[PDB]
Scaffold this active site. Structure first.
Site, short mmCIF file in Angstrom:
data_model
loop_
_atom_site.label_atom_id
_atom_site.label_comp_id
_atom_site.label_asym_id
_atom_site.label_seq_id
_atom_site.Cartn_x
_atom_site.Cartn_y
_atom_site.Cartn_z
N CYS A 100 1.67 -1.80 3.00
CA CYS A 100 2.07 -0.56 2.34
C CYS A 100 3.58 -0.44 2.32
O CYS A 100 4.20 -1.11 1.50
CB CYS A 100 1.32 0.64 2.91
SG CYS A 100 1.55 2.13 1.87
N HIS A 124 -4.45 -0.91 3.35
CA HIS A 124 -4.48 -1.07 4.80
C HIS A 124 -5.66 -1.90 5.26
O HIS A 124 -6.74 -1.34 5.47
CB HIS A 124 -4.51 0.32 5.45
CG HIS A 124 -3.23 1.07 5.29
ND1 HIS A 124 -2.19 0.94 6.19
CD2 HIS A 124 -2.80 1.90 4.32
CE1 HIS A 124 -1.19 1.71 5.78
NE2 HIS A 124 -1.51 2.27 4.64
N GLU A 127 -6.13 -3.02 8.08
CA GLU A 127 -6.38 -2.58 9.45
C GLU A 127 -7.25 -1.34 9.56
O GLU A 127 -7.66 -0.99 10.67
CB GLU A 127 -5.03 -2.35 10.18
CG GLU A 127 -4.26 -1.10 9.81
CD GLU A 127 -3.36 -1.19 8.59
OE1 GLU A 127 -3.63 -2.04 7.69
OE2 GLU A 127 -2.42 -0.36 8.50
CL LIG Z 1 0.37 2.93 8.74
#
Ligand SMILES: [Cl-]
Length: 188
Positions: free
Chosen positions: A79, A166, A168
């Site tokens: 990002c 993302h 994650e």
């Molecule tokens: Cl973040």
């Protein structure tokens, strides 16, 4: 390998670390303002530029890019990290349409890698508060969405990768596997 996560202050940084730890990867989060000599002493086999709220808080991430020959390992920007890479290398970043997070379908047009072995289309967790609007020279688009042309990219010669979303965050389809593919580039 030791994958260093440079913390740009984002809400999901610890999820990067926990995902890598689950995968059995040696990793440490450090402040983005960590001096370069201290980063080098960690013997990084890869570096991740984490998400964060602002391009005004990127610390030494651009300094690492400036000094890339001293590191010479794979880099993944997430990002904010993707955006700061784009700006450094001569692309353009601007405000996108939808700032609120949601699940967005992307199409992987070049499996390359971070998408090796994964489906061609994935639902990913992301915002377009900011977005890479123009691809830097010497980069290639790896993925796109209905309205965002540059959801993921890589340098064509160096192992430097960016994703707008993302991996994650568990809502991201195959997010763990994207991070595993990146870790595999770094060694083990
Ligand atoms: Cl973040």
């Amino acid at each position: 390998m030791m994958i260093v996560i440079m913390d740009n202050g984002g809400q999901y940084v610890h999820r990067i670390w926990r995902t890598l730890r689950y995968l059995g990867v040696e990793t440490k989060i450090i402040p983005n303002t960590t001096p370069l000599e201290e980063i080098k002493a960690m013997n990084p086999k890869g570096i991740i530029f984490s998400g964060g709220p602002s391009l005004e808080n990127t610390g030494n991430c651009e300094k690492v890019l400036e000094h890339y020959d001293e590191f010479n390992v794979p880099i993944l920007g997430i990002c904010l990290g993707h955006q700061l890479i784009a700006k450094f290398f001569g692309g353009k970043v601007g405000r996108g349409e939808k700032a609120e997070y949601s699940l967005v379908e992307i199409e992987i047009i070049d499996e390359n890698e971070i998408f090796k072995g994964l489906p061609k289309r994935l639902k990913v967790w992301e915002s377009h508060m900011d977005e890479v609007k123009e691809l830097p020279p010497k980069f290639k688009i790896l993925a796109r969405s209905e309205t965002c042309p540059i959801e993921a990219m890589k340098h064509e010669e160096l192992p430097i990768y960016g994703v707008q979303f993302h991996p994650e965050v568990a809502h991201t389809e195959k997010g763990e596997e994207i991070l595993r593919n990146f870790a595999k580039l770094c060694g083990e």
